[PDB]
Amino acid sequence: HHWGYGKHNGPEHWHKDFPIAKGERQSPVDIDTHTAKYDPSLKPLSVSYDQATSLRILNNGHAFNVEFDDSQDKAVLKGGPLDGTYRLIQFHFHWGSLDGQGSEHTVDKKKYAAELHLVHWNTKYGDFGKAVQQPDGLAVLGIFLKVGSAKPGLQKVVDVLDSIKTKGKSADFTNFDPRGLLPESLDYWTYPGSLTTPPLLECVTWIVLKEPISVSSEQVLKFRKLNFNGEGEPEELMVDNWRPAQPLKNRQIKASFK
Ligand SMILES: C[C@]12CC[C@H]3[C@@H](CC=C4C[C@@H](OS(N)(=O)=O)CC[C@@]43C)[C@@H]1CC[C@@H]2C=O
Ligand SMILES: [Zn+2]
């Protein structure tokens, strides 16, 4: 009886195995745009993905992960609210059963169709596993998806999903350029938070871009054909793999923009 997104194992159950679920810096949150304070001390975000080297795409029974070779200093996130340099290890999405839900963060209670997370670890802690034990261990870049025009840079991901339908399936996925998933503007909100799945560790500086990307209805419909279940198990469509907004408690959301 492992955690998931269902009635009996979903977000309202996670606190039993992971008591930090009710902690002081949980993610995601609602971004109240009128309360978020413009912080002139925040720097432009530096996203350097020119040398990013993807290895594999994996269905882990929760989402699909596009994984990167993080063995050299290549694909790095720095500046913005960050001190030092954070290395890209993987990206994944959260999405809904319908276009009206799927994002984890919300903006004035607006839910987007999906949300992309690019996960980076602080190079001062040497590897990903050590970084998540630190309050400044990870920087996750969050990007909202709305349904409209296709995102050409997403199509290579969409076209490989047929090969990883079920939990435990993986495929070679080299030479994927994550620059093709970025909106025009790097205007962002930032706040201290957590992983949004177990183990829910309070190790993340969240950087949520204001500008969504557009994807087509056809692109998101292919996300919704994935399965939570393993090959030769009862079909459970991989949909609504999002955690709802958690209490903000004693935190401030800062805006990079006026
Ligand atoms: C691999 C680990 C468990 C899985 C952890 C990872 C740290 C960050 C995320 C990101 C998160 O999703 S999200 N939404 O918070 O970005 C989904 C869980 C995941 C992959 C841990 C690092 C060490 C630990 C075990 O070795
Ligand atoms: Zn995520």
Coordinates of C-alpha atoms and ligand atoms in Angstrom, one line a residue:
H1 CA 0.0 0.0 0.0
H2 CA 2.5 2.6 -1.3
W3 CA 1.7 6.3 -1.9
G4 CA 0.1 7.5 -5.1
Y5 CA -2.7 9.9 -6.2
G6 CA -5.9 7.8 -5.5
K7 CA -8.7 8.0 -2.9
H8 CA -6.9 5.5 -0.6
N9 CA -3.2 6.5 -1.1
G10 CA -3.3 10.1 -2.4
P11 CA -2.1 13.4 -0.9
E12 CA -4.5 13.5 2.1
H13 CA -2.9 10.1 3.2
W14 CA 0.8 11.0 2.7
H15 CA 1.3 12.4 6.2
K16 CA 1.0 8.9 7.8
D17 CA 4.2 7.7 6.1
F18 CA 5.8 11.2 5.7
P19 CA 4.7 13.4 8.7
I20 CA 6.7 16.4 7.1
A21 CA 3.6 16.5 4.8
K22 CA 2.1 18.9 7.6
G23 CA 5.4 20.8 7.9
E24 CA 6.1 24.5 7.8
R25 CA 7.5 24.8 4.2
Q26 CA 5.4 22.4 2.1
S27 CA 4.8 22.8 -1.7
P28 CA 3.0 23.6 -3.9
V29 CA 1.2 26.8 -2.8
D30 CA -1.3 29.3 -4.3
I31 CA 0.6 32.4 -5.6
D32 CA -1.5 35.4 -4.5
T33 CA -0.3 37.9 -7.2
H34 CA -1.4 41.0 -5.2
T35 CA 0.4 39.8 -2.0
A36 CA 3.7 38.7 -3.7
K37 CA 6.2 41.5 -3.2
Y38 CA 8.4 42.8 -6.0
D39 CA 12.0 42.3 -4.8
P40 CA 14.4 44.6 -6.6
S41 CA 17.3 42.7 -5.0
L42 CA 16.3 39.5 -7.0
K43 CA 18.6 38.9 -10.1
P44 CA 17.6 37.8 -13.6
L45 CA 17.4 34.0 -13.7
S46 CA 20.5 32.4 -15.5
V47 CA 19.3 29.2 -17.4
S48 CA 22.3 27.7 -19.2
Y49 CA 21.1 24.5 -21.0
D50 CA 23.2 24.8 -24.3
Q51 CA 25.3 21.7 -23.1
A52 CA 22.4 19.7 -21.5
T53 CA 22.8 15.9 -22.2
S54 CA 19.6 13.9 -21.8
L55 CA 20.1 10.1 -21.2
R56 CA 16.7 8.4 -20.7
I57 CA 13.0 8.8 -20.2
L58 CA 11.4 6.7 -17.5
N59 CA 7.7 5.9 -16.3
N60 CA 8.0 5.5 -12.5
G61 CA 4.3 4.9 -11.9
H62 CA 3.8 8.5 -10.8
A63 CA 5.0 10.6 -13.9
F64 CA 7.7 10.3 -16.6
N65 CA 11.2 11.6 -15.9
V66 CA 13.5 12.9 -18.6
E67 CA 17.0 12.3 -17.0
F68 CA 20.3 14.1 -17.7
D69 CA 23.9 13.2 -17.3
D70 CA 24.8 15.5 -14.4
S71 CA 28.5 14.0 -14.2
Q72 CA 29.9 17.3 -15.6
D73 CA 29.1 21.1 -15.1
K74 CA 26.8 21.5 -18.1
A75 CA 23.1 22.4 -17.7
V76 CA 23.1 24.9 -14.7
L77 CA 20.6 27.2 -13.1
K78 CA 22.0 30.2 -11.2
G79 CA 21.2 33.8 -10.3
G80 CA 17.6 34.7 -9.6
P81 CA 17.2 34.1 -5.8
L82 CA 20.0 31.4 -5.8
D83 CA 23.5 31.5 -4.2
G84 CA 26.0 29.4 -6.2
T85 CA 25.2 26.9 -9.0
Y86 CA 22.5 24.2 -9.4
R87 CA 22.9 21.3 -11.9
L88 CA 20.0 19.9 -13.9
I89 CA 19.3 16.2 -13.1
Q90 CA 15.7 15.6 -14.5
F91 CA 12.4 17.1 -15.6
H92 CA 8.9 15.8 -15.3
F93 CA 5.3 17.1 -15.5
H94 CA 2.1 17.0 -13.4
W95 CA -1.2 17.1 -15.3
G96 CA -4.9 16.6 -15.1
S97 CA -7.7 14.4 -16.3
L98 CA -9.2 17.6 -18.0
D99 CA -7.7 20.9 -19.2
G100 CA -9.2 22.7 -16.1
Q101 CA -6.8 21.1 -13.6
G102 CA -3.3 19.6 -13.4
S103 CA -0.9 22.3 -12.1
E104 CA 0.5 22.0 -8.6
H105 CA 1.1 25.8 -8.1
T106 CA -2.0 28.0 -8.7
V107 CA -2.1 31.7 -9.5
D108 CA -4.9 33.5 -7.7
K109 CA -6.5 30.0 -7.4
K110 CA -6.2 29.5 -11.2
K111 CA -5.2 25.9 -12.1
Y112 CA -3.3 25.3 -15.4
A113 CA -3.6 22.2 -17.5
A114 CA -0.1 21.0 -16.4
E115 CA 3.1 22.1 -14.8
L116 CA 6.7 21.3 -15.9
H117 CA 9.4 20.9 -13.1
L118 CA 13.1 21.1 -14.0
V119 CA 14.9 19.8 -11.0
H120 CA 18.5 21.0 -10.1
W121 CA 20.8 20.2 -7.2
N122 CA 23.2 22.6 -5.4
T123 CA 26.8 21.6 -6.5
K124 CA 28.1 22.6 -3.1
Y125 CA 26.6 19.3 -1.7
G126 CA 28.4 17.1 -4.4
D127 CA 25.4 14.9 -5.4
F128 CA 21.6 14.9 -5.6
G129 CA 21.1 12.6 -2.6
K130 CA 23.2 14.7 -0.2
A131 CA 21.6 17.9 -1.6
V132 CA 18.0 16.9 -0.6
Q133 CA 19.2 16.8 3.1
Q134 CA 19.8 20.6 3.0
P135 CA 17.4 23.5 3.1
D136 CA 19.0 25.0 0.0
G137 CA 19.7 21.7 -1.7
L138 CA 17.5 22.0 -4.7
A139 CA 16.2 24.6 -7.1
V140 CA 13.1 23.6 -9.1
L141 CA 12.1 25.7 -12.1
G142 CA 8.3 25.4 -12.5
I143 CA 6.6 26.3 -15.8
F144 CA 2.8 26.3 -16.4
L145 CA 1.2 24.7 -19.4
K146 CA -2.0 25.9 -21.0
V147 CA -3.8 24.2 -24.0
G148 CA -3.7 26.2 -27.3
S149 CA -0.9 26.2 -29.9
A150 CA 1.4 23.1 -30.0
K151 CA 4.9 23.5 -28.4
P152 CA 7.2 22.2 -31.2
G153 CA 10.0 21.5 -28.6
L154 CA 7.7 19.1 -26.6
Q155 CA 6.8 16.8 -29.6
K156 CA 10.0 14.6 -29.2
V157 CA 8.8 13.9 -25.6
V158 CA 5.2 13.2 -26.7
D159 CA 6.3 10.8 -29.5
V160 CA 8.3 8.6 -27.1
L161 CA 5.5 8.1 -24.5
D162 CA 4.0 5.2 -26.5
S163 CA 7.2 3.2 -25.6
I164 CA 6.9 3.8 -21.7
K165 CA 3.1 3.4 -21.2
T166 CA 3.4 1.5 -17.9
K167 CA 5.2 1.7 -14.6
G168 CA 8.8 0.5 -14.8
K169 CA 9.3 1.1 -18.6
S170 CA 12.2 3.3 -19.7
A171 CA 13.7 4.3 -23.2
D172 CA 17.0 5.9 -24.5
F173 CA 16.3 9.6 -24.8
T174 CA 19.4 11.4 -25.9
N175 CA 20.0 14.9 -27.5
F176 CA 16.8 16.3 -26.1
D177 CA 17.2 20.1 -25.7
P178 CA 15.1 21.5 -22.7
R179 CA 15.5 25.1 -24.1
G180 CA 12.6 24.2 -26.4
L181 CA 10.3 24.0 -23.3
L182 CA 11.0 27.6 -22.0
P183 CA 8.6 30.5 -22.4
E184 CA 9.9 33.9 -23.8
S185 CA 10.0 35.7 -20.4
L186 CA 12.0 34.5 -17.3
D187 CA 9.9 36.7 -15.0
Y188 CA 9.3 34.5 -11.9
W189 CA 7.9 34.1 -8.4
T190 CA 10.1 32.5 -5.7
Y191 CA 9.6 31.0 -2.2
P192 CA 11.1 28.3 0.0
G193 CA 9.3 25.0 -0.1
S194 CA 9.5 21.2 -0.5
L195 CA 9.3 18.3 -2.9
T196 CA 5.7 17.9 -4.0
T197 CA 5.9 14.0 -3.7
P198 CA 7.1 11.8 -0.9
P199 CA 9.5 12.1 0.7
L200 CA 8.3 15.8 0.7
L201 CA 11.7 17.0 1.9
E202 CA 11.9 20.8 2.8
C203 CA 14.9 21.3 0.5
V204 CA 13.6 23.4 -2.4
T205 CA 14.0 27.0 -3.6
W206 CA 10.9 27.2 -5.9
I207 CA 11.2 29.4 -9.0
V208 CA 7.9 29.6 -10.8
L209 CA 7.8 31.4 -14.2
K210 CA 4.9 33.8 -14.7
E211 CA 4.6 33.1 -18.5
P212 CA 3.0 29.7 -19.3
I213 CA 3.9 27.7 -22.4
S214 CA 1.2 26.6 -24.8
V215 CA 0.9 22.9 -25.7
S216 CA -1.8 21.5 -28.0
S217 CA -4.8 19.4 -26.9
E218 CA -3.2 16.5 -28.8
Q219 CA 0.1 16.8 -26.9
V220 CA -1.6 16.8 -23.4
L221 CA -4.0 14.0 -24.5
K222 CA -0.9 11.8 -25.1
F223 CA 0.2 12.5 -21.5
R224 CA -3.2 11.2 -20.4
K225 CA -2.7 7.9 -22.3
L226 CA 0.1 6.9 -19.9
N227 CA -0.6 4.3 -17.1
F228 CA 0.1 4.4 -13.3
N229 CA -0.1 0.6 -13.3
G230 CA 2.6 -1.9 -14.5
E231 CA 2.4 -4.0 -17.8
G232 CA -0.2 -6.8 -17.3
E233 CA -2.0 -4.9 -14.4
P234 CA -5.5 -3.3 -14.4
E235 CA -5.4 -0.1 -16.5
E236 CA -5.4 3.1 -14.3
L237 CA -4.8 6.2 -16.6
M238 CA -1.9 8.4 -15.4
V239 CA -3.9 11.6 -14.7
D240 CA -4.3 14.0 -11.8
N241 CA -0.7 13.3 -10.6
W242 CA -0.7 16.8 -8.8
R243 CA -0.6 17.7 -5.1
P244 CA -3.0 20.5 -4.2
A245 CA -1.9 23.9 -2.7
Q246 CA -0.6 23.6 0.9
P247 CA -0.7 26.2 3.6
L248 CA 1.7 29.1 3.0
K249 CA 2.3 29.5 6.9
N250 CA 5.2 31.9 7.7
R251 CA 6.4 32.4 4.1
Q252 CA 6.8 35.3 1.6
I253 CA 6.4 34.8 -2.1
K254 CA 8.7 37.3 -4.0
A255 CA 8.3 38.5 -7.6
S256 CA 11.2 39.3 -9.9
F257 CA 9.0 41.8 -11.8
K258 CA 6.9 44.9 -11.2
Ligands
LIG1 C1 15.9 10.1 -5.4 C2 15.3 10.7 -4.1 C3 13.8 10.4 -4.0 C4 13.0 10.9 -5.2 C5 13.1 12.5 -5.2 C6 14.6 13.0 -5.2 C7 14.6 14.4 -4.9 C8 13.7 15.1 -5.7 C9 12.6 14.6 -6.4 C10 11.7 15.5 -7.1 C11 10.2 15.2 -6.8 O1 9.2 15.9 -7.6 S1 9.1 17.5 -7.4 N1 7.6 17.7 -7.9 O2 9.2 17.8 -6.0 O3 10.1 18.1 -8.3 C12 10.0 13.7 -7.0 C13 10.8 12.9 -6.1 C14 12.3 13.2 -6.3 C15 12.7 12.6 -7.7 C16 15.4 12.2 -4.0 C17 16.9 12.4 -4.0 C18 17.4 11.3 -3.1 C19 16.2 10.4 -2.9 C20 16.6 8.9 -2.9 O4 17.6 8.5 -3.4
ZN2 ZN 7.1 17.9 -9.8

